[PDB]
Design an enzyme around this catalytic site. Structure first.
Site, PDB file in Angstrom:
ATOM      1  N   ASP A   1       6.813   7.514 -14.388  1.00  0.00           N
ATOM      2  CA  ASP A   1       7.297   7.075 -13.091  1.00  0.00           C
ATOM      3  C   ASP A   1       8.049   5.775 -13.153  1.00  0.00           C
ATOM      4  O   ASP A   1       7.826   4.877 -12.351  1.00  0.00           O
ATOM      5  CB  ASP A   1       6.151   6.974 -12.103  1.00  0.00           C
ATOM      6  CG  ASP A   1       6.618   7.112 -10.688  1.00  0.00           C
ATOM      7  OD1 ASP A   1       7.825   7.454 -10.473  1.00  0.00           O
ATOM      8  OD2 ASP A   1       5.769   6.868  -9.810  1.00  0.00           O
TER       9      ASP A   1
ATOM     10  N   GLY B   1      -2.815   3.174  -3.599  1.00  0.00           N
ATOM     11  CA  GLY B   1      -3.861   2.397  -2.912  1.00  0.00           C
ATOM     12  C   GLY B   1      -3.338   1.188  -2.158  1.00  0.00           C
ATOM     13  O   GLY B   1      -2.224   1.193  -1.665  1.00  0.00           O
ATOM     14  N   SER B   2      -4.166   0.155  -2.081  1.00  0.00           N
ATOM     15  CA  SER B   2      -3.866  -1.043  -1.325  1.00  0.00           C
ATOM     16  C   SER B   2      -3.982  -2.225  -2.277  1.00  0.00           C
ATOM     17  O   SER B   2      -5.006  -2.452  -2.854  1.00  0.00           O
ATOM     18  CB  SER B   2      -4.828  -1.139  -0.134  1.00  0.00           C
ATOM     19  OG  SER B   2      -4.681  -0.011   0.757  1.00  0.00           O
TER      20      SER B   2
ATOM     21  N   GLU C   1      -2.622  -8.680 -13.483  1.00  0.00           N
ATOM     22  CA  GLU C   1      -1.778  -9.893 -13.429  1.00  0.00           C
ATOM     23  C   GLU C   1      -0.947  -9.938 -12.140  1.00  0.00           C
ATOM     24  O   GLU C   1      -0.613  -8.888 -11.567  1.00  0.00           O
ATOM     25  CB  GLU C   1      -0.817  -9.983 -14.619  1.00  0.00           C
ATOM     26  CG  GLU C   1      -1.465 -10.052 -15.986  1.00  0.00           C
ATOM     27  CD  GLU C   1      -0.467 -10.332 -17.103  1.00  0.00           C
ATOM     28  OE1 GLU C   1       0.458  -9.513 -17.367  1.00  0.00           O
ATOM     29  OE2 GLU C   1      -0.637 -11.382 -17.745  1.00  0.00           O
TER      30      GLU C   1
ATOM     31  N   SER D   1       0.838  -1.165   0.000  1.00  0.00           N
ATOM     32  CA  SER D   1       0.000   0.000   0.000  1.00  0.00           C
ATOM     33  C   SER D   1       0.881   1.225   0.000  1.00  0.00           C
ATOM     34  O   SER D   1       2.010   1.201   0.483  1.00  0.00           O
ATOM     35  CB  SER D   1      -0.962   0.010   1.196  1.00  0.00           C
ATOM     36  OG  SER D   1      -0.273   0.070   2.435  1.00  0.00           O
ATOM     37  N   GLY D   2       0.361   2.297  -0.560  1.00  0.00           N
ATOM     38  CA  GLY D   2       1.162   3.494  -0.772  1.00  0.00           C
ATOM     39  C   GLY D   2       0.247   4.451  -1.460  1.00  0.00           C
ATOM     40  O   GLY D   2      -0.984   4.283  -1.337  1.00  0.00           O
ATOM     41  N   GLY D   3       0.826   5.392  -2.220  1.00  0.00           N
ATOM     42  CA  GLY D   3       0.060   6.364  -3.024  1.00  0.00           C
ATOM     43  C   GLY D   3      -0.820   5.800  -4.138  1.00  0.00           C
ATOM     44  O   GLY D   3      -1.655   6.482  -4.685  1.00  0.00           O
TER      45      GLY D   3
HETATM   46  C1  LIG Z   1       6.023  -3.168  -1.728  1.00  0.00           C
HETATM   47  C2  LIG Z   1       6.435  -4.621  -2.212  1.00  0.00           C
HETATM   48  N1  LIG Z   1       6.341  -5.100  -3.628  1.00  0.00           N
HETATM   49  C3  LIG Z   1       5.622  -6.348  -4.008  1.00  0.00           C
HETATM   50  C4  LIG Z   1       6.560  -7.571  -4.144  1.00  0.00           C
HETATM   51  C5  LIG Z   1       5.904  -3.975  -4.546  1.00  0.00           C
HETATM   52  C6  LIG Z   1       4.432  -3.458  -4.349  1.00  0.00           C
HETATM   53  C7  LIG Z   1       3.599  -4.069  -5.461  1.00  0.00           C
HETATM   54  C8  LIG Z   1       2.145  -3.588  -5.448  1.00  0.00           C
HETATM   55  N2  LIG Z   1       1.591  -3.482  -6.898  1.00  0.00           N
HETATM   56  C9  LIG Z   1       1.248  -2.273  -7.502  1.00  0.00           C
HETATM   57  C10 LIG Z   1       1.625  -0.997  -7.017  1.00  0.00           C
HETATM   58  C11 LIG Z   1       1.230   0.191  -7.662  1.00  0.00           C
HETATM   59  C12 LIG Z   1       0.428   0.150  -8.805  1.00  0.00           C
HETATM   60  C13 LIG Z   1       0.027  -1.094  -9.300  1.00  0.00           C
HETATM   61  C14 LIG Z   1       0.430  -2.277  -8.662  1.00  0.00           C
HETATM   62  O1  LIG Z   1      -0.002  -3.415  -9.188  1.00  0.00           O
HETATM   63  C15 LIG Z   1       0.558  -4.586  -8.777  1.00  0.00           C
HETATM   64  C16 LIG Z   1       0.310  -5.742  -9.525  1.00  0.00           C
HETATM   65  C17 LIG Z   1       0.838  -6.973  -9.179  1.00  0.00           C
HETATM   66  C18 LIG Z   1       1.615  -7.013  -8.071  1.00  0.00           C
HETATM   67 CL1  LIG Z   1       2.273  -8.405  -7.598  1.00  0.00          CL
HETATM   68  C19 LIG Z   1       1.858  -5.902  -7.301  1.00  0.00           C
HETATM   69  C20 LIG Z   1       1.350  -4.637  -7.621  1.00  0.00           C
END
Ligand SMILES: CCN(CC)CCCCN1c2ccccc2Oc2ccc(Cl)cc21
EC number: 2.7.11.1
Length: 273
Positions: free
Chosen positions: A135, A18-19, A89, A14-16
């Site tokens: 980004d 969302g979750s 995914e 979670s961060g900017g």
């Molecule tokens: C903070 C630790 N790691 C995960 C190993 C990075 C955060 C990932 C969160 N994230 C993520 C963060 C920000 C935007 C989209 C995101 O989509 C995802 C899709 C699939 C996965 Cl596995 C993860 C995300």
């Protein structure tokens, strides 16, 4: 129908953005990521082909999610009373490049070359679909540890690609280019090349080259680790202060240091198994 059709698990992050939670699609056991964003905290919206009002992130994801890419693809989305929920995914097993670098330190050149090449292919794909990511950085890059395939995440900060100037940026300062710092103006591609410069330095050095604005404006790069003359060149060329002194993606991909890249499979054999 959402809470019936996917099986929720642990919180991944979670961060900017969302979750994000781990997930399994019930239909066919497919692993997925479920990303919840509050409506209140969305500053940028858009509208899809059928003409409904959605977060820009969804617009941009839809534009890059056709076919195989090095982009984590949007599979579905849902609107809720006060949130929007995205199904993406999920590689299994997986690790973000930030954790990977944080754990293994700076990267052998051979490995950085595979990784960086792949990033370049993904970013090209985005641009080719009319999307600008804005980004690119280690924490927005996932590594499928078995396949050696890198995959981009986190749109909006993203935008539609255009050849006019951008006067807005809500990405990461330390990855932002000097022209943004000084003038609050940049062009998509050349600003992307800057951030790839920073990315490549991160990979081969274990850390980002600049921390404060004055370091960015100065645009001067010291190497704390042994890095090849050809790799130092490419890095400095991407981090050229004047945008028009920066290379194109073609020029990057034809640079001597980008020669005989390993395929993802063999990268993982050698470096991840
Ligand atoms: C903070 C630790 N790691 C995960 C190993 C990075 C955060 C990932 C969160 N994230 C993520 C963060 C920000 C935007 C989209 C995101 O989509 C995802 C899709 C699939 C996965 Cl596995 C993860 C995300």
């Amino acid at each position: 129908p959402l809470e019936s059709q996917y099986q929720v698990g642990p919180l991944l992050g979670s961060g900017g953005f969302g979750s994000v939670y781990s997930g399994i699609r019930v239909s066919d056991n497919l692993p997925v990521a479920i990303k919840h964003v509050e409506k209140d905290r969305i500053s940028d919206w858009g509208e899809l082909p059928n003409g409904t009002r959605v977060p820009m992130e969804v617009v941009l994801l839809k534009k890059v999610s056709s076919g195989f890419s090095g982009v984590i693809r949007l599979l579905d989305w849902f609107e809720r009373p006060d949130s929007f929920v995205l199904i993406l995914e999920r590689p299994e097993p997986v690790q973000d490049l930030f954790d990977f670098i944080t754990e293994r330190g700076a990267l052998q050149e051979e490995l950085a070359r595979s990784f960086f090449w792949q990033v370049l292919e993904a970013v090209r794909h985005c641009h080719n679909c009319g999307v600008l990511h804005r980004d690119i950085k280690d924490e927005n890059i996932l590594i499928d540890l078995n396949r050696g395939e890198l995959k981009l995440i986190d749109f909006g900060s993203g935008a539609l690609l255009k050849d006019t100037v951008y006067t807005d940026f809500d990405g990461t300062r330390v990855y932002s280019p000097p022209e943004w710092i000084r003038y609050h103006r940049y062009h998509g591609r050349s600003a992307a090349v800057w951030s790839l410069g920073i990315l490549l330095y991160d990979m081969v050095c274990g850390d980002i080259p600049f921390e404060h604005d004055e370091e960015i404006i100065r645009g001067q790069v010291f190497f704390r680790q042994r890095v090849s003359s050809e790799c130092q060149h490419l890095i400095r060329w991407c981090l050229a202060l004047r945008p028009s002194d920066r290379p194109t993606f073609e020029e990057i991909q034809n640079h001597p240091w980008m020669q005989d890249v390993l395929l993802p499979q063999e990268t993982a054999e050698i470096h991840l198994h």
